[PDB]
Design an enzyme around this catalytic site. Structure first.
Site, PDB file in Angstrom:
ATOM      1  N   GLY A 166      -9.597   8.051  -0.784  1.00 30.51           N
ATOM      2  CA  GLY A 166      -9.839   8.593   0.542  1.00 30.51           C
ATOM      3  C   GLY A 166     -10.008  10.100   0.575  1.00 30.51           C
ATOM      4  N   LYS A 216      -5.729  -1.030   4.962  1.00 30.21           N
ATOM      5  CA  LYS A 216      -4.497  -0.249   4.906  1.00 30.21           C
ATOM      6  C   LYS A 216      -3.717  -0.378   6.211  1.00 30.21           C
ATOM      7  CE  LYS A 216      -6.394   2.999   1.553  1.00 30.21           C
ATOM      8  NZ  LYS A 216      -6.402   4.406   1.062  1.00 30.21           N
TER       9      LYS A 216
END
Lengths: 249, 249
Positions: A172, A12
């Site tokens: 997440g 990311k």
């Protein structure tokens, strides 16, 4: 049986030159004995240092996003730029871009189709939110997403296509999907591909699970029938990512 | 007298490793004998190769965009990542991002503030559309854009701030603003900064014009009292950019 598993690392928007160097050196030292395609998807910035430092033969490099064509698009990166830079893999349609950066089902579909035409291996991301799941719309949301992508693809395109089922409530958050939950969804997606595109494509198609995958839960997740690998976020920035690679049998 | 002029190159979403290399070699060979800050804003991908080859002492490297914080933002590049990469200049709030990628006046403002707080030199872009100019809304549109930015800034922060006035109807259209058109808008912008922030800041503040700037029109444009340089797109991908640098007297 299962096609070649994929262990994809979604870093990311993270990493320093030093921190990522250590991860790459570790990835280079890792002995992987089975047939699995490892993928490192770094930021555009770190693509250069990754191209130079990553030497493990089972690893390939991916971008986390792109647009179809080059031109007057300040801040963005296009597919031909990536192709010129030696990047052949790409992650598209991630939930974070669908939510934050206005990527509808059609916009994602156009990006995937444009990448396939350019010769990219594409990890297309689909998944429902906690809101959509609780309202009993998981199936209608996920199938609509892949249908839009399928609409802009030919049968021969799917050989370069990888689906990453990523339930947004697992992104997440620590709330990893139950092995059954992951299996049930992957079975639904594979069932849809078999009916609308072809049984042969569905057999070859690789459906990855993404959502708080770690070294502890990876093995039992991959043990499921329709799980063909993982798209790892947080645990891919750790030495723990090796265990996930090993967890692909 | 005018503050130190700036010649900024916005390559946008363009360039190959080959084409950009040749372009940088030319920039490296360019003889510049007056005080001017030259800026190269490449794609995130090309930052590394620009950082290794760009050598001219009057040149600095910039990004074309960034988000404030690192984290779960797939496909995006953050300010700490850029700062770790040795990039200290950045273009923010470009009209293409304002239109295509949901960058509102407040989004732009928050990005500028985070960048300044991170030690970045910032080229903040403002400008009205054609329809807004025809309806006489230029003043209320552009001054609201800079007001939103000023909202998150302290007086000392403006030392790290550069304003780029870029009318959307001039962005890559060939329809460049007339010398008096640019002067009027720059006088308006500077007058606002003087009244609302301070006359000292306004004096030192550098206001660049962007929009169809080329080697031919750059000379007369810089002659205007409130034009402190240029933000160049299409012509910055050409050897013509070399002349635009000299056009800052």
């Amino acid at each position: 049986s299962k096609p070649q598993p994929i262990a994809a690392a979604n870093w990311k928007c993270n990493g320093s030159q030093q921190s990522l160097s250590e991860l790459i050196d570790l990835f280079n030292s890792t002995s992987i004995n089975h047939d699995v395609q490892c993928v490192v998807a770094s930021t555009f910035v770190h693509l250069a240092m990754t191209k130079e430092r990553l030497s493990h033969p089972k690893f390939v490099i991916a971008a986390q996003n792109a647009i179809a064509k080059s031109g007057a698009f300040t801040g963005e990166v296009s597919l031909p730029i990536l192709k010129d830079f030696g990047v052949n893999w790409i992650v598209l349609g991630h939930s974070e871009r669908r939510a934050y950066y206005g990527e509808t089902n059609e916009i994602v579909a156009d990006k995937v189709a444009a990448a396939v035409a350019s010769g990219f291996m594409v990890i297309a991301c689909i998944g429902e939110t906690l809101q959509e799941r609780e309202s009993g719309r998981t199936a209608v949301v996920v199938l609509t997403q892949i249908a839009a992508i399928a609409k802009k693809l030919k049968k021969a395109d799917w050989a370069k296509v990888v689906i990453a089922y990523e339930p947004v409530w697992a992104a997440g958050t620590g709330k990893v999907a139950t092995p059954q939950q992951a299996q049930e969804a992957h079975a639904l997606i594979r069932s849809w591909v078999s009916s609308k595109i072809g049984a042969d494509v569905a057999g070859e198609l690789r459906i990855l699970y993404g959502g708080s995958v770690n070294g502890k839960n990876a093995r039992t997740l991959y043990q499921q029938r329709d799980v063909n690998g993982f798209l790892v976020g947080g645990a891919s920035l750790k030495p723990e990512f090796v265990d996930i690679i090993k967890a692909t049998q």
